[PDB]
Design a protein around this ligand. Sequence first.
Ligand code: PRO
Ligand code: PRO
Lengths: 331, 331
Amino acid sequence: LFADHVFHVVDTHTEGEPTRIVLSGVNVKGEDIIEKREYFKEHYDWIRTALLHEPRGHSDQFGAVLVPSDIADFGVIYMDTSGYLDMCGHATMGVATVLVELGIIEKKEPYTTVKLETPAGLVEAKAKVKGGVVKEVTVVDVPSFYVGEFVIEYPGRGKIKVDVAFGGNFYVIADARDLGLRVRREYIKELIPTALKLIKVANEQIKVQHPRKGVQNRINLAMLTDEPEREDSDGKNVVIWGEGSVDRSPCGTGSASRVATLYSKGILKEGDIFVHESILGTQFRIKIVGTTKIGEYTAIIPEITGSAYITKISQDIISKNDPLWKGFLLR
Amino acid sequence: LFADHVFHVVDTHTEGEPTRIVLSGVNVKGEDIIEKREYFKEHYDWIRTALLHEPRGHSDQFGAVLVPSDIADFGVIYMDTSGYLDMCGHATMGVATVLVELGIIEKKEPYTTVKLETPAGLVEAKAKVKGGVVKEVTVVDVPSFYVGEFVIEYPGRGKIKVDVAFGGNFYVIADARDLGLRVRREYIKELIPTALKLIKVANEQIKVQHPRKGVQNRINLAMLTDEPEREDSDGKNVVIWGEGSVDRSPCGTGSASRVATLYSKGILKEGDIFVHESILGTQFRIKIVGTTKIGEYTAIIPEITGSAYITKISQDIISKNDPLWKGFLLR
Ligand code: PRO
Ligand code: PRO
């Protein structure tokens, strides 16, 4: 009686990073996922802030919209508090858990598998299921590659050595101590502004280019590395983008990009596995299960593994006279 | 199949400030609300972090647990990301909306009224209902009073003039420019640390005392005032407590406390109304509908008015093997 709109949203976290997964209330027209995403940006961007800004989300929230697909089981429009990324690791893990545990897809075998049409390419998600429960998901991310290292001018700091790779989005990778901080919990209200400028600066000097239609040709996310805290861990990192959003997970698509750097640098060979640590201490693992050619960059095929957990099953309500229905932030 | 625990949580916002209101899964034993609250702190504090920390909440979230009452319609255990306040304005407005719009209480008249047993006293909530919709709620908050002004030592700043009042919790009120900031959106990552120390410092020098059993005798929240941005507004403020939680509303119980200061300072008379502005620009209105005696302080009876809106209706899920079921934060 009190609702103007109602959305079926199921939440997950993936090593701490939330995905608000929406399963009703969004009809979207389009030939493929890139078209459907543009049709979403035009008519439906208000849903994105109503669901990930406050009060229904928060400064760091994340969303994925299930849509149909002719070329896959479903398509996925990834969205965050600022915009729409071409791919995302943790949200795919979360979509695969919901898709299974809620019985939308046939549970099967030890692994039940989902093909997903994503902006940056078709993405296979392999979920290990015990009983009804998905215990972990392995994402066969899209081909990732190294673009180059660069000496960029960072004001107040001089010249910084910086890597730039693509793991479904383009990333600026840079060691934190090179810019005067350590990625630990305490440096966060300093890590956000630094990493944010690192994206502005990097996109002025460096240019990137992905051959695929719809993949945006700018560095959209910043990744700052440091020594991990745990013994299992090969590397720590925090990924920061948009207006200050901070990945609570080791970030699948960025981790993919890092590994593709270490592959070109020879540090990692095909078949080797890497373990990444978030600023939270949670971890992913990436195997280099293959190689292929993207445009004419040499690309790894990375396989991110982790686990996601349903945390909420919601009917998100837009109440009649809610002056703040659209969502707000203060960061 | 995938759930160890399940909670029926209904969200509201009140001028932007969320209340996660829980309606199932909590049996609590106790003679009154103070006993039931202690029984909650002992066995059930894990629910509080699982519901307001991440990933089910966030840095700024708020909760209220409905429990039975012999002396009222219900009792309410208020909780936040740090602890449990004795009273809270916006959560009561939110509980009254849910209690009506969901048909838990008989909708009636122009106003349908609810009596609530809260830690700091019995609290009447009057909801204006159009059709099914609650358009606003008026909270007859508990008797509020002025305790004194004080010259406290704030390191790095010298001596600050500071007021201390009780509006259901004790507050440190202090002008922001007196401590070198302006309460606007941009000063928030500086307003949190300042206001936080202002609570540590204030509680070392100043002592407070409320005669009622269960009302904690410490200043629990800090309120920093400045010139408002809007013309309707009599005063702007931001309320900050716990480990950095920031009120997105003008804060009912603190606004009550401010008014009780302005009443003793004579600036406001009985019957006058005040309009408060949050750091978000949202507003409450308080009338001084009466006076009474608390212990032997002279106390106003403040009536906070605003509106709250259901934003989510959730089944909060604790999944089987979720290492992070209990909740985490990074601020
Ligand atoms: O896990 C990931 O890859 C996502 C991408 C954006 C934020 N973190
Ligand atoms: O509106 C209020 O009064 C609540 C009290 C704690 C935070 N804000």
